Design an enzyme around this catalytic site. Structure first.
Site, PDB file in Angstrom:
ATOM      1  CG  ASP A   1    -116.315   4.881 -20.061  1.00  0.00           C
ATOM      2  OD1 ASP A   1    -117.379   5.355 -19.604  1.00  0.00           O
ATOM      3  OD2 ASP A   1    -116.271   4.111 -21.052  1.00  0.00           O
TER       4      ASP A   1
ATOM      5  CD  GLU B   1    -118.525   1.823 -19.721  1.00  0.00           C
ATOM      6  OE1 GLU B   1    -118.495   1.631 -20.951  1.00  0.00           O
ATOM      7  OE2 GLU B   1    -118.926   2.872 -19.188  1.00  0.00           O
ATOM      8  CD  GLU B   2    -116.592  -1.833 -22.690  1.00  0.00           C
ATOM      9  OE1 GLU B   2    -117.185  -2.905 -22.947  1.00  0.00           O
ATOM     10  OE2 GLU B   2    -117.177  -0.731 -22.723  1.00  0.00           O
TER      11      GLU B   2
ATOM     12  CG  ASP C   1    -117.773   0.246 -26.478  1.00  0.00           C
ATOM     13  OD1 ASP C   1    -117.333   1.341 -26.073  1.00  0.00           O
ATOM     14  OD2 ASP C   1    -119.002   0.003 -26.553  1.00  0.00           O
TER      15      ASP C   1
ATOM     16  CG  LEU D   1    -115.377   5.245 -27.346  1.00  0.00           C
ATOM     17  CD1 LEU D   1    -114.351   6.320 -27.639  1.00  0.00           C
ATOM     18  CD2 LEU D   1    -115.667   4.405 -28.578  1.00  0.00           C
ATOM     19  CG  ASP D   2    -118.926   7.643 -21.204  1.00  0.00           C
ATOM     20  OD1 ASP D   2    -119.354   6.670 -20.548  1.00  0.00           O
ATOM     21  OD2 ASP D   2    -119.510   8.739 -21.279  1.00  0.00           O
TER      22      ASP D   2
ATOM     23  CD  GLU E   1    -119.761   5.939 -17.290  1.00  0.00           C
ATOM     24  OE1 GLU E   1    -119.706   5.212 -18.305  1.00  0.00           O
ATOM     25  OE2 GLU E   1    -120.754   5.985 -16.534  1.00  0.00           O
TER      26      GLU E   1
ATOM     27  CG  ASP F   1    -123.911  -0.587 -21.483  1.00  0.00           C
ATOM     28  OD1 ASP F   1    -125.099  -0.351 -21.158  1.00  0.00           O
ATOM     29  OD2 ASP F   1    -123.057   0.353 -21.601  1.00  0.00           O
TER      30      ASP F   1
END
Ligand code: F6P
Ligand code: MG
Ligand code: TL
Ligand code: TL
Ligand code: TL
Ligand code: TL
Length: 329
Positions: free
Chosen positions: A112, A91-92, A68, A114-115, A274, A62
């Site tokens: 997450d 997520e990061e 993010d 920022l999704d 998520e 990604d």
């Protein structure tokens, strides 16, 4: 005017009987602060020059957008300073975060920060997603503490940075929505004990993958456009940000799908930060969440960045698709 029912109060008053340490209230208070800071940054990102990328392939893969990096940083520092968490999965970050001994609390948080990456630059709704587990081992905190089935979730939700900023929070007794009052920087209860409709009239999926769809998905969409009983065809909606599409599914009913397809056996969306939080929310509101073959919350993950197919929303819509999967199997 003068008796404002905030997230803090509602939660506090909630488990006033189930006593407890209250690190959950500390935790949620902390999260709220990060959400407010992300909301403010997002609402002026073109002025703050926060559009574009940071540059880099994320976990499995990604691009890293500047918002993010910013959002991730904020959520991690507030969680850490809350004194309520011991393991963090973002997520990061390739690996789970272990909080330093002095600030450890008993909760594990998957999030997450920022999704809805693809929607940032065009100003469509984006959001923040989280799931909170209690640590159940007794040994030193580790990545393993995050590999729990969503069923073990104690609290989950998301912040929707839409036309308004909304914090949707699910816990053992149900779902409630809190809207950000930009004037006083508080999340105020606006919808209590939300329940999804039994059947909706909207379907939400990216039909651009039609060529890769399984025949069950194919048949189901076809049935939404050409109803066998002459009922009105469903309307379609796909915002492209999972938080927006799922929130609309929650309050208007219907179904949301990111299924497995010929190139993605486990789908795209990530189970831990998520799919599981949204499944839990959906389940506490009277809805369902499946892979098409099993309950999302019953999956026992083996990878904190594991992917999972997900189908959720109104129970009678989700059950109709499941019947189609069961027929094709
Ligand atoms: O462009 P696609 O494949 O429909 O992906 C959209 C999905 O990706 C996400 O941005 C997460 O990666 C979700 O918010 C959204 O549901
Ligand atoms: Mg993200
Ligand atoms: Tl990302
Ligand atoms: Tl993003
Ligand atoms: Tl994703
Ligand atoms: Tl992702």
């Amino acid at each position: 005017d003068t008796n404002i029912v905030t997230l803090t109060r509602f939660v506090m008053e909630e488990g006033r009987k189930a006593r407890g340490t209250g690190e959950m209230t500390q935790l949620l208070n902390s999260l709220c602060t990060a959400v407010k800071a992300i909301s403010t940054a997002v609402r002026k990102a073109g002025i703050a020059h926060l559009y574009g990328i940071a540059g880099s392939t994320n976990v499995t893969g990604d691009q890293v957008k500047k918002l993010d990096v910013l959002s991730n940083d904020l959520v991690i520092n507030v969680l850490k300073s809350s004194f309520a968490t011991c393991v963090l999965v973002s997520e990061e970050d390739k690996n789970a975060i272990i909080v330093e001994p002095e600030k450890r609390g008993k909760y594990v948080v998957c999030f997450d920060p920022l999704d809805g990456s693809s929607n940032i630059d065009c100003l469509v709704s984006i959001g923040t997603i989280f799931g909170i587990y209690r640590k159940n081992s007794t040994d030193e905190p580790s990545e393993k503490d995050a590999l729990q089935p969503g069923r073990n979730l104690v609290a989950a939700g998301y912040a929707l940075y839409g036309s308004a900023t909304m914090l949707v929070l699910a816990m053992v007794n149900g779902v409630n929505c809190f809207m950000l009052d930009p004037a006083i920087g508080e999340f105020i209860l606006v919808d209590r004990d939300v329940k999804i409709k039994k059947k909706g009239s909207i379907y939400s999926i990216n039909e651009g993958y039609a060529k890769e769809f399984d025949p069950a998905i194919t048949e189901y969409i076809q049935r939404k456009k050409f109803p066998p009983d002459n009922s009105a065809p469903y309307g379609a909606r796909y915002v492209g940000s999972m938080v927006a599409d799922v929130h609309r599914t929650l309050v208007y009913g219907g179904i949301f799908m990111y299924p497995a397809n010929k190139k993605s056996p486990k789908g795209k969306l990530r189970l831990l930060y998520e799919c599981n939080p949204m499944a839990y929310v959906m389940e506490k509101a009277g809805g369902l969440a499946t892979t098409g073959k099993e309950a999302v919350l019953d999956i026992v993950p083996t990878d904190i960045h594991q992917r999972a197919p997900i189908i959720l929303g109104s129970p009678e819509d989700v059950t109709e698709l499941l019947e189609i999967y069961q027929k094709h199997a």
